[PDB]
A paper describes a structure:
The LRR-RKs HAESA (greek: to adhere to) and HAESA-LIKE 2 (HSL2) redundantly control floral abscission. A receptor protein called HAESA is found on the surface of the cells that surround a future break point on the plant. When its time to shed an organ, a hormone called IDA instructs HAESA to trigger the shedding process. The peptide hormone IDA binds to the HAESA LRR ectodomain.
To understand in molecular terms how SERK1 contributes to high-affinity IDA recognition, we solved a 2.43 Å crystal structure of the ternary HAESA – IDA – SERK1 complex. HAESA LRRs 16–21 and its C-terminal capping domain undergo a conformational change upon SERK1 binding. The SERK1 ectodomain interacts with the IDA peptide binding site using a loop region (residues 51-59SERK1) from its N-terminal cap. SERK1 loop residues establish multiple hydrophobic and polar contacts with Lys66IDA and the C-terminal Arg-His-Asn motif in IDA. SERK1 LRRs 1–5 and its C-terminal capping domain form an additional zipper-like interface with residues originating from HAESA LRRs 15–21 and from the HAESA C-terminal cap. The four C-terminal residues in IDA (Lys66IDA-Asn69IDA) are conserved among IDA family members and are in direct contact with SERK1. We found that HAESA senses IDA with a ~60 fold higher binding affinity in the presence of SERK1, suggesting that SERK1 is involved in the specific recognition of the peptide hormone. In this case, there was no detectable interaction between receptor and co-receptor, while in the presence of IDA, SERK1 strongly binds HAESA with a dissociation constant in the mid-nanomolar range. In our quantitative biochemical assays, the presence of SERK1 dramatically increases the HAESA binding specificity and affinity for IDA. This observation is consistent with our complex structure in which receptor and co-receptor together form the IDA binding pocket. Comparison of our HAESA – IDA – SERK1 structure with the brassinosteroid receptor signaling complex, where SERK1 also acts as co-receptor, reveals an overall conserved mode of SERK1 binding, while the ligand binding pockets map to very different areas in the corresponding receptors (LRRs 2 – 14; HAESA; LRRs 21 – 25, BRI1) and may involve an island domain (BRI1) or not (HAESA).
Author numbering:
A (entry chain C): 26 to 211
B (entry chain A): 21 to 616
C (entry chain B): 56 to 69
Write the structure that this text describes.
């Protein structure tokens, strides 16, 4: 409510918002549960942030990790730059992380492996570099993965939850190797 | 034109002037100093003041300006004057009465020699700078000072007791500084001419000193955002001329003083966000009260009738307390009520019938009480309303027709009550309505087609009602609709085939209805649809292949009459719970289709 | 420019 509203307001200040989709994000409200693009559970705690295809730019903030009951984070089809914040892995109840179709740079954080309830992970169409963290194989619930159209490289793991994924999850990357690609590793 | 022209131009040389705010100064035409911008004179052509407010001037403090012999006021308000002040900066300034250096980029400490150098000062403001170190104890030597504003700096240590020595003070503003934890100095009680005391965000602790009863000519007392403790003292009643008391965000406990009722001059009282217990004082006679905020405390008992004697009351916020009983039946009849929030209390009985008696009510927020009965006809005439939240009460009966069509109403939240009747045609009037929340009620009849002509609607949430008939085709005309939840109703018929209008629709929940026909193929081309619940209906035909284009988080088509092959991306085991209770569905393996 | 919060009533609501 107070703490969650302050995090989301810190996000608003940091984003550029030409179409005023965050007009309703009034910091004088006791909680953000009447705000547009935000959904709360019966206890007035944030469970969804739905900001897809909203012509947003700027970068995300690390204060997003205070949203402990967040289940769905949709930030897709924007022009968001900068790194995926490392402490998005503090979002222990997250089911869907949908950051696809942006200009995110730098690595996929190792911390995303701590998202033990994550089901959907769609990071495609970004400028993400480095390797795919092994810790992601240990998310038992992970069933939909798209890292395609990035600049990822190194070994693509194929154990655990990654055993389900086909080449289409990893297509058009910089330098990926392993069984799921045609190329064995260096 | 005398040394005044020379001295002013030297001062201009020391400052960077990117906006050319001083172009009249260094641009001749033989014009004398008295008609230069920001420079004012007396009858004998002596520069008596210099005001350079909001000129975007950058550079160190221009000490050369004090070489003007007749200078009385110097304002550099709202510039980028930077660096620090020093003793040498104010040597020649001994004729100054007024000095405003606020909203600049000054750093370092306040020079200790300032009172010795500026004996005639009545006004000193260095507010909104980056000053550090302690407030000098030498400030007790000021013999004429009437106003001191050092608010919004990084001043450290504690508020010096010697400031009590400066009995000429009418305004003391030290708010938002980086002081050590400390009690309000007792010596401030000696300042018997004080009208304004603003020590907000000063890291204060302990009780309000009894000394401060002697500040009898206080107008505004603001101690917000500290850690003050104890009772709000009963001697605030003896402040004969007090108009504003701001005590919110502290650790005040005990009861509000019962004597409060006779504070006839009081306009604005806020002791919200404390640990206050007991009752709101009764026998109130607050003739001039504009604002009463006591939200987020542990106040118990009723709202006394005598609040209606406050005929200029515009703001009443008592939310998040343990308040009980019926509201005064005449509340708002003879006052310009504007913002009312009584959320999260235990209020019972009827909403006062003339609460918008004077046509000024904007917020009516009564969440989570036990308000029973109906919304009166007279609230339908309240055309100033923007934010209505009545949810989680015991309210019942039909909503008056004019209430739905209020022209500025933005958020209308009636959810979780026992409201009956149909939504009338008069809702065309609500042209600013963006958020309609009417879930968990007993609303009936068709969703009227007139909702579709309200272009600015973003959420419609009307689940758990008795709505029947078809979904209006005009709901597809709503380009900015991001949530539609009409689940758990008696709706029938099919959903419109042409859906490209719903370009912002993120959530579509039509579950637990009597809906029929095909799932439209255009559902698959909605750009931001992520939550699709069409479960527990009578939908027939094939699941469109176009649904594979969607990046859904919730997909639920369970308990319908769907048949034919499952689209190949959704035939995966991981999506199988999305299609439970559709006996006719099959998984095609290229040739063989099996009912699983 | 440092925006110093005014000496006024809290605007919190809901
Ligand atoms: C402080 O100074 C600034 C800059 O001189 C003032 O802002 C200008 O004045 C108005 C403000 O709405 C606008 O028309 C200009 O475009 C502003 N210029 C800017 C921001 O560069 C500001 O009004 C002053 N503030 C106070 C409180 O006096
Ligand atoms: C102003 O006061 C309120 C209530 O006293 C503060 O809100 C509480 O803050 C703590 C953390 O410091 C939270 O754990 C509680 O959940 C909050 N309580 C309520 C009732 O909301 C608020 O932080 C204070 N604000 C400032 C700026 O000091
Ligand atoms: C799809 O929706 C149906 C309801 O239409 C869900 O099944 C219900 O689950 C609730 C528990 O929340 C129980 O009361 C019943 O077992 C079900 N109700 C009916 C009317 O059958 C189902 O959980 C949803 N499926 C998914 C995958 O989310
Ligand atoms: C003096 O304080 C002001 C405001 O508190 C500071 O100005 C800000 O500095 C940061 C970091 O450079 C910027 O991101 C902001 O844009 C600045 N302006 C405002 C209005 O916040 C300033 O840095 C401080 N200066 C010194 C020397 O301490
Ligand atoms: C994703 O990236 C590829 C390669 O740059 C591009 O061809 C495609 O258009 C992108 N997808 C979308 C939906 O824009
Ligand atoms: C997958 O294999 C790697 C390498 O042996 C191992 O470190 C990782 O923990 C394994 N993860 C799972 C879930 O088996
Ligand atoms: C004042 O500001 C300018 C930059 O805005 C800077 O060059 C100058 O050195 C500053 N003065 C001091 C004393 O730091
Ligand atoms: C109000 O009542 C108290 C005691 O009951 C008294 O001390 C106070 O001075 C009175 N104030 C006014 C303004 O009448």
């Amino acid at each position: 409510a107070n703490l969650e509203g302050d995090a989301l307001h810190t996000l608003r200040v940091t984003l550029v918002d030409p179409n005023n989709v965050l007009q309703s994000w009034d910091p004088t409200l006791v909680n953000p549960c009447t705000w547009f693009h935000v959904t709360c559970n019966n206890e007035n705690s944030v469970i969804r942030v739905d900001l897809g295809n909203a012509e947003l730019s700027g970068h995300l903030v690390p204060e997003l990790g205070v949203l402990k009951n967040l289940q769905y984070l949709e930030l897709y089809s924007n022009n968001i730059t900068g790194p995926i914040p490392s402490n998005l892995g503090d979002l222990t109840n997250l089911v869907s992380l949908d950051l696809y179709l942006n200009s995110f740079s730098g690595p996929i954080p190792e911390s995303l492996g701590k998202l033990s309830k994550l089901r959907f992970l769609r990071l495609n169409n970004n400028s993400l570099t480095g390797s795919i963290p092994m810790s992601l194989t240990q998310i038992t619930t992970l069933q939909v993965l798209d890292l395609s159209n990035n600049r990822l490289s190194g070994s693509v793991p194929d154990n655990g939850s990654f055993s389900l994924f086909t080449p289409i999850s990893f297509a058009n990357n910089l330098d990926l190797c392993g069984p799921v690609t045609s190329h064995p590793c260096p | 034109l005398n040394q005044d022209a020379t001295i002013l131009r030297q001062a201009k040389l020391g400052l960077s002037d990117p906006a050319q705010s001083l172009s009249s100064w260094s641009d001749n035409n033989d014009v004398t100093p008295c008609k230069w911008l920001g420079v004012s004179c007396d009858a004998t052509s002596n520069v008596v003041s210099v005001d350079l407010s909001s000129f975007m001037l950058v550079g160190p403090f221009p000490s050369i300006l004090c070489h003007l012999p007749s200078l009385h006021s110097l304002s550099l308000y709202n510039n980028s004057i930077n660096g620090s002040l020093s003793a040498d900066d104010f040597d020649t300034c001994h004729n100054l009465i007024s000095l405003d250096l606020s909203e600049n980029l000054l750093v370092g400490s306040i020079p200790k020699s300032l009172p010795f150098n500026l004996p005639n000062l009545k006004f000193l403001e260095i507010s909104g700078n980056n000053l550090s170190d302690t407030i000098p104890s030498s400030f007790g030597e000021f013999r004429k000072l009437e106003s001191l504003n050092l608010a919004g700096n990084f001043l450290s240590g504690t508020i010096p007791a010697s400031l009590g020595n400066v009995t000429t003070l009418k305004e003391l503003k030290l708010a938002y500084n980086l002081f050590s934890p400390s009690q309000i100095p007792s010596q401030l009680g000696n300042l018997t001419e004080l009208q304004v005391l603003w020590l907000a965000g000063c890291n204060l602790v302990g009780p309000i000193p009894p000394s401060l009863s002697r500040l009898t000519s206080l107008v505004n007392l603001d101690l917000t955002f500290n850690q003050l403790t104890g009772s709000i003292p009963s001697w605030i009643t003896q402040l004969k001329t007090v108009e504003q008391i701001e005590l919110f965000n502290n650790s005040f406990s005990g009861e509000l003083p019962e004597s409060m009722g006779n504070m006839t001059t009081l306009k604005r009282f806020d002791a919200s966000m404390n640990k206050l217990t007991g009752k709101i004082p009764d026998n109130l006679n607050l003739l001039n009260l504009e604002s009463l905020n006591l939200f987020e405390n542990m106040l118990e008992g009723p709202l006394p009738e005598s609040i209606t004697r406050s005929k200029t009351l515009s703001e009443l916020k008592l939310f998040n307390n343990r308040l009980t009983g019926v509201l005064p039946s005449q509340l708002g009849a003879n006052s310009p009520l504007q913002y009312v929030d009584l959320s999260y209390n235990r209020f019972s009985g009827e909403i006062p019938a003339n609460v918008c008696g004077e046509g000024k009510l904007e917020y009516l927020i009564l969440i989570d009480n036990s308000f029973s009965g109906e919304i009166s006809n007279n609230l339908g005439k309240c055309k100033s309303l923007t934010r209505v939240r009545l949810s989680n009460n015991k309210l019942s009966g039909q909503i008056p027709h004019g209430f739905w069509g209020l022209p500025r109403l933005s958020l209308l939240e009636l959810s979780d009550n026992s409201f009956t009747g149909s939504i009338p045609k008069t809702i065309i009037g609500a042209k600013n309505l963006s958020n309609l929340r009417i879930s968990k009620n007993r609303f009936s009849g068709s969703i009227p087609n007139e909702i579709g002509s309200l272009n600015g609607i973003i959420e419609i949430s009307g689940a758990e009602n008795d709505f029947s008939g078809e979904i209006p085709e005009s709901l597809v005309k709503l380009k900015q609709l991001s949530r539609l939840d009409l689940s758990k109703n008696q709706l029938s018929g099919e959903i419109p085939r042409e859906l490209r209008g719903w370009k912002n629709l993120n959530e579509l929940n039509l579950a637990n209805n009597h809906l029929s026909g095909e799932i439209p193929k255009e559902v698959g081309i909605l750009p931001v649809l992520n939550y699709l619940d069409l479960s527990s209906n009578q939908f027939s035909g094939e699941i469109p292949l176009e649904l594979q284009n969607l990046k859904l988080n919730v997909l639920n088509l369970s308990y319908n009459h769907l048949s034919g092959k499952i689209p190949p991306l959704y035939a995966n085991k991981i999506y199988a719970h999305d299609f439970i209770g559709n006996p006719g569905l099959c998984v095609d393996l290229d040739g063989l289709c099996r009912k699983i | 420019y440092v925006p110093i919060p005014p000496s006024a009533p809290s605007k919190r609501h809901n």
